[PDB]
Amino acid sequence: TTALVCDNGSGLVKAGFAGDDAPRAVFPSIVGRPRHQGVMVGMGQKDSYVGDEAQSKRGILTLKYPIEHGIITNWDDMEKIWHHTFYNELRVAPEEHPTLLTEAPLNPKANREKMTQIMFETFNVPAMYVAIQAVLSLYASGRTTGIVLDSGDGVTHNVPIYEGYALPHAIMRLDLAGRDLTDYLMKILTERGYSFVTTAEREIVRDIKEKLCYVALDFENEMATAASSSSLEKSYELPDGQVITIGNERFRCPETLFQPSFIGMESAGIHETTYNSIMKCDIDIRKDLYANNVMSGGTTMYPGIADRMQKEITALAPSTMKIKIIAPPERKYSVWIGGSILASLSTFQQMWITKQEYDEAGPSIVH
């Protein structure tokens, strides 16, 4: 049997077998219990709706993302995510396949152990391994050097890798993008009188965060032309018939990635965390970290990136240095195409942690 790559998204959990095209299942991670009393008599209602069904049944449930700030809320809901994914999307039994699971870089111990341990006893997989989402994006882009960005709602990361070794002393985790950008967009859309305070309605905010937002070339000059009469406004239509016109806030929300002072948080922008991680690496290596700046994750899919990022880095970086920023299409599925390449390779079959070895070793094998 065929191995299964299942990505523990922050979004947007992604699932598909090993090779060779695209993921089979992608869905918004949400679990939602019903906040109102039923009067139908069937009864016909589920105890907890997962996505996609919880995104079709908005407004009668209370949506709860099971992974928040890069860590799982409880494994009771997480197990339901897994069960739903394997059985009613992929249509496969875990006993049939070796699996490949993903994690986030700088995640607290003992949450990789507890995960691995529960998943082996609950789903009875014959072998498993847990890879960080950032490392996998190297394979997806066909690179062997560069700084890797796993940016999902709501934890971004900046990991530098050099042919083909990782540098522990320069790894940066920012809790900045993207769920706090969702919350910030909701705070500056209230300023235009649209009240979307409720949990369900927050998903609609997320959808306009995808579609209508853009990044400026320079903030001050976009603000200048905003003061002018020329329309930057785009009109969105809402499920109850309402028409929302956003303009100024449209470029304000993504610009936060370069200026976190908009949220009021002390942390520095992607601009400077890129530079400061490069300048924590040895002198000879710095040469090839420039021009292997590879963006990844769905929250980097705004149009004005990477050429904003490019212009800003080129201004702070040493003169006459070659800087190219690598941003392909499909960054949301980058991780999955990474994992797919990995699990197909020899000899990594023998790098998987198998059940008998796990049973003897216990949680200490993980690291």
Binding site: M40, G42, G44, Y87, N88, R91, V92, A93
Partner: protein
């Protein structure tokens, strides 16, 4: 025992010879006898003990030392190359179709040879069942029934004709009723027989051809009764299946002076035919006779369906020849085509949503000329039929019309087609029974023929009612077997003994119990304001969370069943094993909605042939109850009569002579309920041998003095000498009865030390002289007491 041969699971032959050379807790390391070095693994429940002499066959299977399904499979493998197609298992006849006519077996001299002869003393044949059923009618003072199962091509048609031949030859003096069923067989090959995934010609109804006998023991008449029909198949079919055969034979065989009167067109047009397979069965010669306008795109692409007997163009001719012979004129034959063509033009009527005016549904504009060409076939008005297919007529006592929803009108339009064709098949059977009216009624010997346990890779609602019908017939099958064995032990003087019975009532309660059963939840889901199939599947494991007869699809070992999601199907264990069913379209196929506004319109037709077909509360009626109610009218009739179970075996997939497939025969032994009955008989005494059988087997091992004795005293002396345990071995009246594996234990005592056996015969020599004295003394006193009876009786004359 060690060193002794066992049967081994071989995929191509079912079971082969083999030995055990290593063993573990759950597995046996099996080395084959003929293929040494192949050494495979097999489980504890997959191996069976084999007999020492495997080159011999037995007419009666209770004469085996090891009675199991592997020694039954080898008994019908040896008998197949000796051309012995009939095999006696107690009250069960196993008949294997050879696909060739065997000499002298159907002879009238053979028929009068069997007549009145005792049972078991004559070779197994189908005439030995029919002669027994006449004698266990008149003596018993009760009516009889011959039960014929099996899949298509297993000889169930041919075995039925030999039963009706024996009753109008051996006991019936005249009455030519036997071939009136045979002559109007193509009518039931069109109306009742359809096409399923594993069978090209399958009967989909409970055929109960009964033969009336009077008190003077003469054939006074016959009657044909029909039970069950696949209501769903009429309007919607599965993948690669067909509807009934009259909806293809009328399309294929119709002329152009008939097509102008019925307005027939190619099957692609019609919604009740384009869902499944539109192809006709034909041969090269008849493929040239099918007209261009009768061909569908699927027919152009893939051509005619291949079968050695079915011809949809040519059997329409032999159908209309049989309607001339039975009793139908050409005007009445045309009225049996106007009803069929009216069903075809009903299924294309669609229903959109009304424009907010009073709620409900309206017909589509593309369905307007399609209604005009349908209402003159039904004898009704097009403006009154449009109201009746969209409204719920009731009274407030004025009479109001309250419109229906779109989904309820699609179900009501197909409910009219599942009512008109249902009463049309009941009119064909009643018309045939009026072509041979019975003189009187009293006792009866009938033949029940129906399809066996039939199942496919993905099972439908049509196969759910077949396997539910075979489970209820499996209950009555084991109930009659236990009663025969309890009156065998009494007849041989062994008296009553304890035997364990296997129940299947928990599987019946699972499917049909009130409020909690699967059919009861299904009929309740129709009453809901929004029916669902995901709510139906979850409700089954809501009310039945425990039980062993029901599991989730993912618990199955089969990969195909593991791809089914929890809310898309379920697995129900039956006598023939674990059968999965999908739940998509299950409620839709059950839902029927024939209501007042439409039931009291087709009865009111301006046509006279239509009113003859149909001879507040309840609205939607109870659809899942009609399948239980009609079956109970046959099960209590089978309990009121005697029974003669004839199981029919198909030996190969091609249906060609002299070919044995033991990977297809063994699957029919486990799908006939035969293996289940052999499990029942292990509780009793499954091995029994007559005194003359034990004399022919064991006389060579005995001393010459003991050998001189008659078979009963030979066996009585041998039982007394050895000192055999009374609960394991039992001395009957004509047979010695044995517990499991003790006829085999007996055979090893005779093959053991000749000097030890000779010394035990010396020790019983006084008793044997005393027994041989009392045998001739009480036999001479028997002749004197029958001399004293002749005088005592003639003293009162």
């Amino acid at each position: 025992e060690d060193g002794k041969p066992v049967w081994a699971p071989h995929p191509t032959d079912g079971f082969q010879v083999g030995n055990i050379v290593d063993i573990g807790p759950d597995s046996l390391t099996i080395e084959p006898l003929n293929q040494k070095g192949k050494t495979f693994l097999a489980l504890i429940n997959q191996v069976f003990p084999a007999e020492e002499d495997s080159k011999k066959d037995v007419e009666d299977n209770c004469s085996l030392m090891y009675l199991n399904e592997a020694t039954l499979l080898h008994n019908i493998k040896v008998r197949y190359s000796k051309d012995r197609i009939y095999t006696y298992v107690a009250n069960i006849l196993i008949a294997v179709n050879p696909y060739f006519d065997i000499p002298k077996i159907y002879s009238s001299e053979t028929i009068k040879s069997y007549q009145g002869k005792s049972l078991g003393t004559m070779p197994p044949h189908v005439f030995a069942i029919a002669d027994k059923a006449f004698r266990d009618m008149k003596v018993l003072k009760l009516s009889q029934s011959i039960i014929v199962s099996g899949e298509s091509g297993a000889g169930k048609t041919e075995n039925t004709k030999f039963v009706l031949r024996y009753l109008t030859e051996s006991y019936g003096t005249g009455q030519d009723i036997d071939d009136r069923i045979v002559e109007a067989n193509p009518l039931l090959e069109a109306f009742g027989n359809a096409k399923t995934v594993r069978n090209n010609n399958s009967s989909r109804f409970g055929k109960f051809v009964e033969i009336h006998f009077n008190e003077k023991s003469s054939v006074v008449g016959g009657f044909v009764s029909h039970y069950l029909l696949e209501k769903s198949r009429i309007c919607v079919q599965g993948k690669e299946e067909r509807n009934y055969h009259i909806f293809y034979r009328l399309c294929a065989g119709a002329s152009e002076d008939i097509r102008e009167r019925l307005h027939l067109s190619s099957p692609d047009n019609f919604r009740y035919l384009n869902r499944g397979c539109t192809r006709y069965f034909a041969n090269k010669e008849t493929d040239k006779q099918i007209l261009q306008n009768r061909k569908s795109p699927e027919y152009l692409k893939a051509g005619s369906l291949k079968d050695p007997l079915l011809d949809d163009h040519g059997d329409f001719i032999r159908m209309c020849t049989a309607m001339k012979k039975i009793g139908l004129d050409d005007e009445e034959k045309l009225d049996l085509f106007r009803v069929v063509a009216g069903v075809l033009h009903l299924g294309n009527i669609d229903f959109e949503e009304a424009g907010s005016t009073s709620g409900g549904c309206n017909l589509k504009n593309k369905s307007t000329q399609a209604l005009e060409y349908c209402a003159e076939l039904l004898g009704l008005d097009q403006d009154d039929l449009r109201v009746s297919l969209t409204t719920r007529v009731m009274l407030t006592t004025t009479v109001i019309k309250v419109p229906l929803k779109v989904e309820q009108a699609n179900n009501a339009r197909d409910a009219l087609a599942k009512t008109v064709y249902s009463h049309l098949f009941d009119h064909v059977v009643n018309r045939v029974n009026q072509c041979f009216p019975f003189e009187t009624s009293s006792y009866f010997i009938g033949v029940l023929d129906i399809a066996g346990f039939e199942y496919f890779e993905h099972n439908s609602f049509e196969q759910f009612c077949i396997n539910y019908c075979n489970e209820k017939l499996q209950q009555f099958f084991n109930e009659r077997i236990l009663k025969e064995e309890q009156e065998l032990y009494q007849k041989e003087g062994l008296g009553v003994n304890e035997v364990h019975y296997v129940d299947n009532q928990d599987c019946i309660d699972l499917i049909e119990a009130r409020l909690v059963g699967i059919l009861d939840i299904l009929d309740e889901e129709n009453r809901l304001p929004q029916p669902s199939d995901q709510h139906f599947t979850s409700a089954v494991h809501q009310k039945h969370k425990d039980h062993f007869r029901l599991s989730i699809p993912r618990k199955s070992k089969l990969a195909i069943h593991r791809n089914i999601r929890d809310d898309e199907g379920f697995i129900i264990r039956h006598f023939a094993g674990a059968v999965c069913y999908e739940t998509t379209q299950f409620v839709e196929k059950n839902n029927d909605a024939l209501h007042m506004s439409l039931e009291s319109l087709i009865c009111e037709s301006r046509d006279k042939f239509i009113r003859e077909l149909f001879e507040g509360k309840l609205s939607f009626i109870s659809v899942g109850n009609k399948f239980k109610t009609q079956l109970n009218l046959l099960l209590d009739k089978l309990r009121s009569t005697g029974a003669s179970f004839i199981r029919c075996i198909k030996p190969n997939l091609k249906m060609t002579s002299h070919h044995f497939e033991g990977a297809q025969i063994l699957s029919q032994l486990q799908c006939s309920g035969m293996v289940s009955v052999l499990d029942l008989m292990q509780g009793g005494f499954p091995s029994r041998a007559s005194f003359h059988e034990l004399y022919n087997m064991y006389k060579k091992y005995m001393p010459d003095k003991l050998a001189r004795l008659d078979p009963r005293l030979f066996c009585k002396a041998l039982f007394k000498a050895l000192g055999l345990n009374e609960i394991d071995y039992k001395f009957g009246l004509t047979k010695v009865f044995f517990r499991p594996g003790k006829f085999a234990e007996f055979d090893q005592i005779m093959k053991s030390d000749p000097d030890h056996l000779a010394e035990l015969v010396k020790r019983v020599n006084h008793w044997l002289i005393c027994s041989r004295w009392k045998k001739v003394q009480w036999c001479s006193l028997s002749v004197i007491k029958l001399k004293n009876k002749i005088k005592y009786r003639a003293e009162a004359c």
